[PDB]
């Protein structure tokens, strides 16, 4: 005693592109330039840092020197914000007498 009467039914299979030809051949390639893990790239500031700073040393033993830097400084382009964070060097006083200087060299 089974039953089960209802069924199913499609027409629809299947196509191909018969229009199209391969009478030649074709060449190609692969020019993929990509690749990256780890590259940090500090020069902007880690340069300067030690440039900016290394002006004010050379002003610790001469003061007199100090007023030709505070002019180059200016010259490259240089601000208290970046200066400053130059001249920081983690310390609650390291480059003041320099970095002073230079503020009123600009206060003008």
């Given amino acids: 005693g089974s039953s089960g009467s209802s069924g199913n039914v499609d027409s629809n299979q299947n196509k191909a ?10 060449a190609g390639g692969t020019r993929l330039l990509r690749v990256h893990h780890e590259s940090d ?9 030690a440039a900016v700073k290394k002006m004010a040393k050379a002003i610790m033993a001469d003061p007199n020197k100090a007023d ?5 400084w200016a010259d ?3 601000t208290l914000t970046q200066m400053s964070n130059f001249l920081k060097s983690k310390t609650a006083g390291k480059y003041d007498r320099v970095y002073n200087g230079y503020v009123i060299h600009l206060d003008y």
């Fill in 68 to 72: 030709e830097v505070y002019k180059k």
């Fill in 17 to 26: 592109s018969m229009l199209q030809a391969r009478l030649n051949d074709e």
């Fill in 41 to 49: 790239t500090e020069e902007r500031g880690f340069l300067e840092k």
């Fill in 76 to 78: 490259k382009g240089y």
